[PDB]
Amino acid sequence: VSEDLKDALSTFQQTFVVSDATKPDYPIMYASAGFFNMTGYTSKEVVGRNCRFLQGSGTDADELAKIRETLAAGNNYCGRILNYKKDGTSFWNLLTIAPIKDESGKVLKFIGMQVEVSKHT
Amino acid sequence: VSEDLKDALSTFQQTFVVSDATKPDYPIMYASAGFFNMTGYTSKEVVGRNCRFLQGSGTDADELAKIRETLAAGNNYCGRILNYKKDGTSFWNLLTIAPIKDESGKVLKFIGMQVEVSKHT
Ligand SMILES: Cc1cc2nc3c(=O)[nH]c(=O)nc-3n(C[C@H](O)[C@H](O)[C@H](O)COP(=O)(O)O)c2cc1C
Ligand SMILES: Cc1cc2nc3c(=O)[nH]c(=O)nc-3n(C[C@H](O)[C@H](O)[C@H](O)COP(=O)(O)O)c2cc1C
**Does A18 contact B8 at a Cβ distance shorter than 8 Å?**
yes
**Does A75 contact B80 at a Cβ distance shorter than 8 Å?**
yes
DSSP chain A: --HHHHHHT----EEEEEEETTSTT--EEEE-TTHHHHHS--TTTTTTS-GGGG--TTS-HHHHHHHHHHHHHT--EEEEEEEE-TTS-EEEEEEEEEEEE-TTS-EEEEEEEEEEE-S--
Determine the structural domain holding residue B110 and report its residue range. Answer: 1-121
CA pair distance B34, B67, nearest whole angstrom? 22
Closest-CA distance, B76 to chain A, in angstroms, reads 6
- Choose from A18, A39, A43, A78 for mutation: most chain B CBs within 10 A: A78
Q: Residue A24 is which amino acid?
A: P
Whether ligand 2 lies within 6 angstroms of the CB of B21 is answered as no
CA pair distance A2, A4, nearest whole angstrom? 6
**Does A75 contact B1 at a Cβ distance shorter than 8 Å?**
no
Instruction: Look at chain A and report how many structural domains it folds into.
Output: 1
Q: Residue A43 is which amino acid?
A: S
CA pair distance B114, A28, nearest whole angstrom? 22
CATH number at residue A93: 3.30.450.20
Which residues make Cβ contacts (< 8 Å) with residue B19, sequence separation at least 6?
A: B26, B27, B28, B29, B50, B51, B109, B110, B111, B112
This PDB structure is determined at a resolution in Å of 2.1
